[PDB]
Design a protein around this nucleic acid. Structure first.
Ligand SMILES: [Zn+2]
Ligand SMILES: [Zn+2]
Ligand SMILES: [Zn+2]
Length: 131
DNA sequence: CAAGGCACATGACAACGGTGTTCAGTGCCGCGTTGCCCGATACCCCCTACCCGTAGTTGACTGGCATCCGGGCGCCGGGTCGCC
């Protein structure tokens, strides 16, 4: 996980933690679990590094209904969209050219030069209903 | 003269006002800690220059050295050969 800044142990640690975790996580709870591992990193430095990763793009970032920015890495680097369970957090990556073609058709119809598409579908998970 | 009808105001009724808290997150901006990058520095190599130890050198050449006295002074102590 190369970073723009000079490599070191702490960014390697947070990158490894993101690698192991395959769920949407917020910065403060990420720091909580990171401290639980025992690295004892600083909150603002964690903020700096995760902002850098979000800028780099290898970690997808979503915004919750409360307004929180939640980050997680995707195995595949191609652009896609994530289906997430609010109760459990199971993030599954799917992509379809139909939505993209729809976006380009709308942009051309309205004469838009460039566009940015953001699509997240929220829904109720299958296993949580069962007890 | 008493009973029945209309005005204004009134006991509650929430919802705005405005401002104060609270979450909580994410930075903002001053204190300290970190990967680089090089640069010099100790430490392997090769070469030869020079220090230092060993071993020969065949006419003959076969016993030295200069001592030491003007203490001085007395005693101890033992040795040492005469003594009868
Ligand atoms: Zn993604
Ligand atoms: Zn898309
Ligand atoms: Zn679920």
């Amino acid at each position: 996980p190369p970073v723009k800044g000079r490599a070191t142990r702490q960014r390697a640690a947070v990158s490894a933690a993101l690698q192991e975790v395959e769920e949407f996580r917020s910065a403060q709870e990420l720091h909580d679990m990171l401290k639980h591992k025992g690295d004892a990193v600083g909150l603002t430095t964690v903020y700096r590094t995760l902002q850098s990763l979000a800028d780099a793009g290898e970690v997808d970032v979503l915004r919750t209904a409360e307004g929180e920015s939640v980050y997680r890495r995707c195995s595949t680097g191609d652009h896609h969209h994530h289906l997430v369970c609010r109760a459990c957090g199971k993030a599954v990556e799917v992509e379809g050219p139909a939505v993209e073609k729809w976006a380009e058709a709308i942009a051309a119809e309205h004469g838009y030069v460039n566009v940015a598409h953001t699509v997240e579908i929220f829904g109720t998970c299958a296993d949580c209903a069962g007890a």
